[PDB]
Design a protein around this ligand. Structure first.
Ligand SMILES: Cc1ncc(C[n+]2csc(CCOP(=O)(O)OP(=O)(O)O)c2C)c(N)n1
Ligand SMILES: Cc1ncc(C[n+]2csc(CCOP(=O)(O)OP(=O)(O)O)c2C)c(N)n1
Ligand SMILES: [Mg+2]
Ligand SMILES: [Mg+2]
Lengths: 788, 788
């Protein structure tokens, strides 16, 4: 009898649904007089109205039904919100359940607390309109549309008993990130993971246009959602008496299929991809609000979004209509004299930790356990001489990630857009394979590593790929993202959303516990110009990350394999940061030992003693490199200068942590003025060789005393197709161009070095001519190693 | 008998198909000996192999069939390429048709030209691997995957007889932008536009993973593409004798339905959305290449993508296998002694302008006609006194765009993410409405402006929306894009792709004719904090545009309505630039007359004489503003300083064109050093008030002499919910914060202005306290106007 509902409990469900809508309008409009004891007056209304109403009836409608289902079956839900502007619906339900009062004691369940609850919403010094981190039981901000469904799957990536209900707006569903995210049901594993129940709020209207998915036929819509792999269920109408029975029946129908699918998967009798249940709602937008106000339809139309009436203070007629709107819910029976909800509402509310707004999964920092990782020195390569031994840097990282997977079989996952095999990370394929959960052929078995059980996710859409990871970290787990640098502009919008969440959670919100860090690995940098990716790769993703504050994002550019392992080991321990690691796939030199890499990453920036020419004397020039390809050119430039100018004294500085360049005033993590002056001399010129746009270094080191003597060579532009050496010539980061620049800046080499500067220009022209004749660099260029 | 094919012509089609694959492998591998007259030797092979082979057989297979269909029905095709790495297939067909020889006389149809044709591909000083602007008959760069289908629809937005064939890779269909772009059939109007025939290359494998759409069932795949609204047709197998007959039959089936749909729409008897034809190909990836090389399957698998064999020079066995691969096409019969294609291939090639690689639509600059622009002074607002009259700035722009629509009914369109009504641009709705081509209700008629015929497209997904515009401009037409600034990070990847195309077309390619400019309008800036959008809006889109060269992007920030019209009028005339216009939706002051706005936009940056305090004397401080909200604060700061310091001399400078700040050496458009020193004094401090990140101004004006005296206030961070005045206080761009800053920088006000600086801090505290109690700014703040 779960599908059917008793008539008596339907009134209590409707009473909860009315109370949620009453509180929703109250915080949108009312500033004082919460219970309408006295007649409404303009001083009780907020001056500026930024709340959103269009999604509020739908979210409150689903939420109360879920509380009914969570009482009987003793489930656990999260309720990630799609539209994101339906926060009044969530906060009203959180207040009714008592969760909001416990989190915020000021908003007590009383008449005075109700006045404070309405006052704080959409107000200066108060909670925001969207689903902010201050909102209890929320992981998805929802301000940017299209990432809600991916966050639903990410929260259930390793929780078997968890159930996630994601409400999808029809205006949101046409977005590119949400169009692909439906296919994520295939990669979800029913045996070891929870079930996500998507709900489509097909209200029919956007802010100003009819929705695309409501203006298609019912047959075409059913065809479309069958192709996505979901079992479609349709709930239509606008009569609450009909809608309560139908929607409760459909919810009971879907959850039993969800339990049937999970039980069949864990039993192993049905090892195949099932069509997951899904619910479609055709309820009109704002169907519990005013119908017609100014001669136009305000219910079930685009006019129902965020504004029932434009002006209330100016026009007393609208205020009278507003007062009648609040009276339509009959608030007198819903609340007592004290202002608390009546005993009918208290009984039907979930009790204890089972409350969806109080689920520990949403506040994943409490659920988070520290990652158990082995020592990286076991997987580090051995270097007898720095700069003379050549080995690929991807293999040590792949082995290290494999060891973490075995030691952390549940709370760790790896994400890659078909570049895990490309980036030579096949070491993790030894123990675990990628998860596909589809039809397989024996040709696939020999070729690709695919299985139903796996810890590596695979999809080309980086939108849904990063959406899985962001929710995975906010749930309390740990993850790692590896991709090309060329396609990092795709996730540009999503990173800013996640950086916004961490910034508010760390500072403004006090009850939010810290979650794991966001580790993004960028491979195949713009300098090598690999076969994949467009010809004009852009390293501009590093710049937009630096636009975010240094207290939420960290950028690391390790030169070699050992320094890559130390960065990867250190970043897996951090909590409230976004870690961007830029390493190159191609085989390179190795400069640091396993022990020396740890010391280097501890400081972040340090002098390389073997590369440095003279110690105990003031250097004539400071040569600095940041990336790994440009580090080789910086080292090769040092070899040429030391060969042709024996008396020249060169200090070599390598920077791994970019934000160390920022002064100590900007952030405590940055180097102090005395520390910076020790590394880079106060007066001698600095020849910085930066991977990426050369101006980014000037932004960080602007406040430094020696900024005027800082010279940066970096990425400027790329030709259609170029050799690795001649691409550096175009951007003037080649070994010869750096050596030319050092001659110019050093005061006593501008006259002595004229012959050498002429010789270097001959080498530039000679190598370019050989590149045009043969198409490949000279053998002594590719096989270069540190002379001394 | 169009569906069936004669056996004799099938051999000629196969002969063309073999020749295309032979030329495809030749340019990938061979550097010399194009016709294999002598046995193959390693010096004939390219040293580094950056070509991709996996998509090449499929593209050549479709192209030769299309040439068959274009001969009989006398159609016109474009063949936008999805994978983008199938450029060898395109260039081979272009060379065979003779188009490439005409465009590039060096690559003549001869043995010597064949040697040059193979040599130039994937080589320094040669054509790139992807389909670049150098490729004849190409509009889509194809390096980024997911934007191909949108470019197919955009090229046919106003060409009625044009037919566009877009080949879609199955791996590309995993991308978010491609998943949404299927629904673009609904926005396409069959009556006045051409038909786009999408082809799905469902080969089953990506570079390293099986494709998602091949691992779904045939029934679910058919359900998915029915929901998109397309008529699905399936072509499967790997036998050329079978595949030639089936694929030619399906093409003839689809084109007649395309002609039936277009004829029915133009007759008006069938005014409904039809199911467009679509073709699905299950051919294995690289099914004409080697099968097994190193004990693994290299045909119809992920190994077929990119290069089939890793080493050729090192291993002579692979070179022998490579030689056998070239012999499998039997090149001796395909070419004569001179190296030209035989008379069998010449006869079946399209003749004249009908060649798809030589279609004038692809080189849209030739097709482009100058826009007929009505004088904007008719729609400009009237201002008797600058800074005292308040009027909304969106309405004059909407009227101006309406007039352009009537005067240019065919080659002009508007694009918005259902924000045109939000942007108060309903003036264009008077004459033309939005295009929907779906079911409609009388409620929609009163509320929304929807009709089958329209010039404004409105879909929320900016990926497909911006993709429509890019192809529209490359076709030779004109357009205008309007959207919010908060969601400009969505089109971040797409803008860099378009700027790459224009930069190469401007300099490297000489036969490319100039096309229309890309005009993007950004509204609802971060300062107003409208109801829509997330609370933490980011103006970072301005910064990433500036990362690209100043010779391809222009950024305009007009302060008022008249300056907005002059910018919009001027940018509709420009050709090879990306124009980003940042104006604010909210009602503001007006500072410039219709005539004075034209003079202001002519210079780009100019002194405002009425705002300037003293003329004929050296100013004590230069106050500069860039945006429109920050311009009001800069003006209000000037009013306070002139009120409290009568002796103070203030010069007010407003900048509209951002790149004018760059020195003349960086670009000829930038101001000279003497011009910059006239505007901004060489020694007096400059208080710059910039909309967006404050460091962008330092990047542009870094090389200036007076850069050290430049002080920029701009966007730093935004709270959860703030009033417009309080948000400026936190970012220190408020009128009081600017007035405080002027007191600090001016040497003779640091002592005299201590009392005034104390008074200003009281005003900051007072307004914040009023904001917290009331939630709205004081009435005199909102109704401020210029006193003098
Ligand atoms: C990509 C993008 N386009 C537009 C917006 C602006 N926006 C914010 S909320 C909203 C309404 C979405 O409508 P729908 O998904 O139907 O939700 P409903 O309110 O009807 O439940 C829009 C257009 C946005 N945030 N992101
Ligand atoms: C968004 C994105 N993800 C990944 C890549 C890298 N990439 C370039 S080509 C390619 C292969 C996918 O091509 P597919 O659509 O399978 O084409 P087909 O081989 O069938 O022609 C990949 C993954 C990219 N360019 N863009
Ligand atoms: Mg809607
Ligand atoms: Mg493929």
């Amino acid at each position: 009898d779960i599908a059917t509902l008793s008539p008596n409990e339907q009134a209590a469900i409707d009473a909860w649904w009315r109370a949620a809508n009453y509180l929703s309008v109250g915080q949108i409009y009312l500033r004082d007089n919460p219970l309408l004891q006295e007649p409404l007056r303009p001083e009780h209304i907020k001056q500026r109205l930024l709340g959103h109403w269009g999604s509020d009836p739908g979210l409150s409608f689903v939420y109360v039904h879920l509380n009914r289902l969570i009482r009987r079956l003793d489930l656990n839900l999260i309720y990630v919100t799609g539209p994101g502007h339906g926060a009044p619906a969530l906060l009203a339900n959180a207040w009714l359940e008592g969760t909001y009062s416990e989190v915020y004691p000021n908003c007590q369940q009383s008449t005075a607390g109700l006045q404070q609850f309405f006052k704080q919403f959409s107000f200066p010094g108060g909670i925001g309109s969207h689903c902010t981190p201050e909102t209890p039981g929320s992981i998805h901000e929802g301000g940017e549309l299209g990432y809600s469904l991916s966050h639903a799957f990410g929260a259930a990536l390793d929780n078997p008993d968890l159930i996630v209900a994601c409400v999808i707006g029809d205006g949101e569903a046409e977005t590119g990130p949400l169009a692909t995210s439906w296919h994520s049901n295939k990669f979800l594993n029913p045996a070891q993971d929870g079930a996500v129940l998507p709900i489509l709020h097909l209200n029919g209207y956007k802010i100003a246009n009819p929705t695309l998915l409501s203006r298609i036929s019912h047959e075409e819509l059913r065809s479309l959602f069958i192709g996505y792999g979901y079992e479609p269920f349709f709930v239509e109408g606008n009569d609450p008496a009909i809608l309560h029975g139908v929607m409760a029946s459909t919810l009971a129908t879907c959850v039993q299929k969800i339990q049937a699918i999970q039980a069949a998967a864990r039993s192993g009798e049905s090892s195949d991809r099932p069509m997951w249940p899904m619910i479609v709602l055709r309820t009109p937008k704002g169907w519990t609000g005013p119908a017609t106000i100014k001669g136009h339809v305000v219910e079930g139309s685009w006019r129902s979004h965020q504004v029932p009436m434009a002006d209330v203070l100016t026009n007393p007629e609208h205020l009278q209509l507003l007062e009648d709107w609040l009276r339509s819910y009959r608030p007198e029976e819903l609340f007592d004299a004290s202002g608390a909800p009546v005993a009918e509402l208290q009984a039907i509310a979930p009790i204890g930790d089972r409350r969806m707004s109080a689920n520990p999964v949403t506040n994943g920092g409490l659920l988070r356990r520290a990652l158990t990782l082995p020592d990286f020195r076991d997987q580090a390569v051995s270097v007898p001489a720095p700069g003379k031994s050549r080995a690929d840097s991807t293999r040590p990282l792949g082995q290290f990630l494999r060891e973490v997977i075995r030691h952390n079989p549940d709370n760790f996952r790896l994400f890659g857009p078909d570049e895990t095999a490309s980036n030579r990370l096949d070491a993790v394929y030894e123990v675990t394979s990628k998860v596909w959960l589809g039809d397989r052929i024996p040709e696939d078995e020999d070729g690709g590593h695919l299985s139903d059980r796996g810890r590596v996710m695979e999809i080309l859409s980086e939108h849904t790929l990063e959406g899985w990871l962001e929710a995975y970290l906010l749930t309390g787990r740990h993850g790692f993202f590896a991709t090309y640098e060329a396609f990092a502009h795709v996730i540009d919008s999503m990173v800013n959303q996640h950086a916004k969440w961490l910034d508010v959670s760390k500072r403004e919100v006090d009850w939010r516990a810290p979650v794991s860090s966001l580790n993004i690995l960028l491979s195949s940098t713009v300098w090598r110009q690999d076969h994949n990716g467009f010809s004009h790769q852009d390293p501009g993703f590093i710049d937009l990350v630096t636009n975010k504050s240094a207290r939420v994002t960290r950028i690391y550019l390790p030169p070699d394999a050992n320094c890559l392992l130390s960065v990867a080991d250190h970043c897996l321990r951090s909590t409230d940061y976004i870690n961007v690691i830029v390493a190159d796939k191609q085989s390179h030199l190795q400069y640091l030992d396993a022990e020396a890499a740890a010391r280097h990453c501890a400081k972040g920036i340090g002098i390389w003693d073997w590369a440095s020419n003279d110690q105990g004397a003031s250097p004539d020039v400071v040569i600095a490199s940041c990336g790994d390809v440009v580090t080789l050119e910086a080292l090769a430039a040092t070899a040429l200068l030391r060969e042709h100018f024996p008396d020249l004294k060169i200090r070599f500085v390598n920077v791994v942590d970019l934000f160390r360049l920022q002064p100590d005033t900007e952030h405590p993590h940055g180097l102090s003025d005395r520390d910076f002056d020790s590394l880079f001399t106060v007066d001698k010129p600095i020849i910085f060789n930066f991977h990426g746009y050369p101006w980014l270094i000037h932004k960080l080191a602007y406040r430094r005393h020696n900024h005027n003597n800082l010279h940066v060579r970096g990425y400027k532009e790329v030709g259609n197709i170029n050799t690795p050496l001649e691409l550096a010539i175009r951007n003037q980061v080649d070994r010869f161009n750096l050596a030319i620049d050092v001659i110019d800046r050093v005061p006593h080499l501008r006259d002595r070095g004229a012959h050498v500067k002429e010789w270097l220009k001959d080498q530039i022209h000679d190598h370019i001519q050989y590149a045009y004749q043969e198409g490949i660099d000279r053998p002594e260029i590719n096989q270069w190693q540190w002379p001394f």
